[PDB]
Design an enzyme around this catalytic site. Sequence first.
Site, PDB file in Angstrom:
ATOM      1  CG  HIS A  19       0.559  -0.601   0.998  1.00 60.52           C
ATOM      2  ND1 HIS A  19      -0.645  -1.244   0.794  1.00 60.52           N
ATOM      3  CD2 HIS A  19       0.330   0.330   1.956  1.00 60.52           C
ATOM      4  CE1 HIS A  19      -1.564  -0.725   1.594  1.00 60.52           C
ATOM      5  NE2 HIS A  19      -0.999   0.236   2.307  1.00 60.52           N
ATOM      6  CD  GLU A  59      -3.018  -7.708   1.662  1.00 65.09           C
ATOM      7  OE1 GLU A  59      -3.861  -7.045   2.305  1.00 65.09           O
ATOM      8  OE2 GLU A  59      -2.005  -8.196   2.205  1.00 65.09           O
ATOM      9  CG  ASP A  75       0.542  -3.471  -3.102  1.00 66.24           C
ATOM     10  OD1 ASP A  75      -0.117  -2.799  -2.275  1.00 66.24           O
ATOM     11  OD2 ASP A  75       1.014  -4.598  -2.829  1.00 66.24           O
ATOM     12  CG  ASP A  94      -3.786  -2.672  -1.070  1.00 65.24           C
ATOM     13  OD1 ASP A  94      -2.975  -2.460  -2.011  1.00 65.24           O
ATOM     14  OD2 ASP A  94      -3.407  -3.025   0.062  1.00 65.24           O
TER      15      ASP A  94
HETATM   16 MN   LIG Z   1       0.966  -5.636  -1.234  1.00 66.98          MN
HETATM   17 MN   LIG Z   2      -1.156  -3.396  -0.395  1.00 65.28          MN
END
Ligand SMILES: [Mn+2]
Ligand SMILES: [Mn+2]
Lengths: 289, 287, 286
Positions: free
Chosen positions: A115, A261, A113, A218
């Site tokens: 994030h 995502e 990720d 992402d």
């Molecule tokens: Mn995530």
């Molecule tokens: Mn993310």
Amino acid sequence: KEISVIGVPMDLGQMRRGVDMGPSAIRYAGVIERIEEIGYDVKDMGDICIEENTKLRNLTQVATVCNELASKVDHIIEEGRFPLVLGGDHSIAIGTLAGVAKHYKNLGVIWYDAHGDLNTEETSPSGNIHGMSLAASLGYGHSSLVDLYGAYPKVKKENVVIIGARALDEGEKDFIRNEGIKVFSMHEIDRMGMTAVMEETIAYLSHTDGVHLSLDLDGLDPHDAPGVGTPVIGGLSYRESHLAMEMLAEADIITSAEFVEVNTILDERNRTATTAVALMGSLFGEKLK
Amino acid sequence: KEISVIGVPMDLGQMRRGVDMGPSAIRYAGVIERIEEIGYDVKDMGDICINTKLRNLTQVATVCNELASKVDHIIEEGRFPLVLGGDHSIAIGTLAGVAKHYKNLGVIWYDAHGDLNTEETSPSGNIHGMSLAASLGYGHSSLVDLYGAYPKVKKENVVIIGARALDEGEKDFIRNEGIKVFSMHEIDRMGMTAVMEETIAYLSHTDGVHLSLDLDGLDPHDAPGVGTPVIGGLSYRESHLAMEMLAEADIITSAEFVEVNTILDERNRTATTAVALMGSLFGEKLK
Amino acid sequence: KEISVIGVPMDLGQMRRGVDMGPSAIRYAGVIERIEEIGYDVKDMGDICINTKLRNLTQVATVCNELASKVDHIIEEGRFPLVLGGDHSIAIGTLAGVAKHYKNLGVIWYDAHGDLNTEETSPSGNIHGMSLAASLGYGHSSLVDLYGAYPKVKKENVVIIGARALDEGEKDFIRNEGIKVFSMHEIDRMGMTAVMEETIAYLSHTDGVHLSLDLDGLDPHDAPGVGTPVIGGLSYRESHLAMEMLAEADIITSAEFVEVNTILDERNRTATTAVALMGSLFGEKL
Ligand SMILES: [Mn+2]
Ligand SMILES: [Mn+2]
Ligand SMILES: [Ca+2]
Ligand SMILES: [Ca+2]
Ligand SMILES: [Ca+2]
Ligand SMILES: [Mn+2]
Ligand SMILES: [Mn+2]
Ligand SMILES: [Mn+2]
Ligand SMILES: [Mn+2]
Ligand SMILES: [Mn+2]
Ligand SMILES: [Mn+2]
């Protein structure tokens, strides 16, 4: 050698980001035939049909979908099959991990990720539950999420490895430091190389009785994965991620997975979904030689 | 420093892939002037005018026969033959011409594909997916015995670099025949510098080395205009470094650059990159 | 933690290259707010309002003289000068201003080009291809003696990173004067971590270090919007890492970010990248 696929076309949060189109795009990219061609039996469970609060956006609906997802993932594992979850937004991991946690007593998680998704309602700048899904699965956050499908933490802090992080909020950086979460940021991956990162990851989780892969597209650079909910420059290449999946396949430690995502609105001729299918192909045993 | 350039605008197989435009595109990118700028004398020889199991077999043999004699003649004249490609089946003619002048010839096959199919293992019938196997003596007699009824290259003298789209039959051939192959995963683990050092050492016992560079060995981000793009390939920087290391080793005695496809290219930038790679191969240095 | 920012929208030379748009595009990408978010006090000095062998020489000296005196005043005020570029010729004025306060100044020249031409070695007459040489004391006296009749930088205190488009005379200058240069091939062999460690060690004895970052040091894939793009460059990941390593070394005492060209950019992403690299330089950690 048996997989059950379930799609969760959820796009909730501060605003739509288009990630509800993920499951459809990944299916368009031929995910079912790709895994079948490797030699697996694949059961397509289909997609879950998805029918004010500023600090926890769409909380009731997120909890409703995650409860249904947790029970379906639970029952896939009860039947002895591998659960493969196809995402919209990363908050579906709350349900995935709640279902997986019914079947493992020392579960590893690899969180791939840009994030950390380590926010709580206090530290979140947006109220997006998809920015909270790892914290909630660790037991931090709203009771509706942390006690979902079981009133206990689904994952232990010492069993998490985050790979690819580059857009952490200040409160997430504090959580990581104070709680000792193992994190490979982009700077460490540049210094070590992905091969060394993956060997350390597999060694770090050697004691677990199963490992869940939670792969947010992402984590990859927008050059290789433009079609994602929240693109962040400076990410992992296709080559690095493909190699990582092959090393996980060789280690034979992944016992559940979700790919989330994917956002067709920003994609270019579905090529992020095509890349997601290629990463799954590598995860499930395809070799280049 | 003498080079003779020949273009072969061949685009055969199951369907047009646009790679017949490769020689014109590479010339448009200024290949002749670029090589002359380095200090070479360049003779442009111009371009050669051009069943479901071995598609276009008769025509491929005809063109490769003519290419083989022209490459032979270039070497007879003491010049370096540089072949500009359409599809990779022209390697059959190029290696047949080169093999007249070397008895322990090395080959570096820079490619997303192995091109190791035979009539039996090919899922398509495309001869450009068979040219390395045919040059090793495996395949139809029209191809393996072209311009000389003997194998043109020995299996122990081949190094494939960039592989990531191998068919199951090609994987078995590589494993059962001991072909040296650096797949993309091995390149990621080792790094391009160490891959090229091992390649140069692996071919240490050869009396010449042919570079067969398929532009689809590079990632489509760097080489979008190729006949059959395959994601996850080599960067421009890795390839440019590899050419510089080959130049410094001074082992390359003939070369072909194939599979440029202008239809998928972006403002000719794949052909521009091919010329830059040739510039590095022929001695350009950054310092 | 005090920064003063000045924009220099200069686009001189043989032909327009669009780099006069750099400061506006970088401000559009939020450079001021971004530096403030990290915790800095940011004084925005605004923008400066703007021969064939030394093209536009008179105008370049005028702008560079004004820039040198403003940079002087920023350092005199005890603040960090951050210059936002058009042409790389503005380095002449920046380094002239800096060298009034640093007599053993280090310079990291992050660039696809050496900018080591003189009036005699230049194939174009572009002064932006001469700004490093002129700051080393080589070139026309209008530039070499600008805002001070002495060389602003010592040849032994220069590191060039990212070179891949050197002219033949520039390669000679590098060889004959012992200029430390990391070309792309050395970066690929060594890796950017080892290059930056060696760079930092090499400048150990300087009293300050000026970073002159030309966005065309980065590959056009990551920085399409530059005056003169050259394929085969540094990635955003490599450059972001290099900025973080400089930040932790705490050696950078002035900086300029130049050559952003909005005409070739894609939705301003090159300027956005420049702001991200500045964020890393000024202490953002992952
Ligand atoms: Mn995530
Ligand atoms: Mn993310
Ligand atoms: Ca689109
Ligand atoms: Ca085109
Ligand atoms: Ca534009
Ligand atoms: Mn149950
Ligand atoms: Mn002969
Ligand atoms: Mn080929
Ligand atoms: Mn190929
Ligand atoms: Mn410059
Ligand atoms: Mn430059």
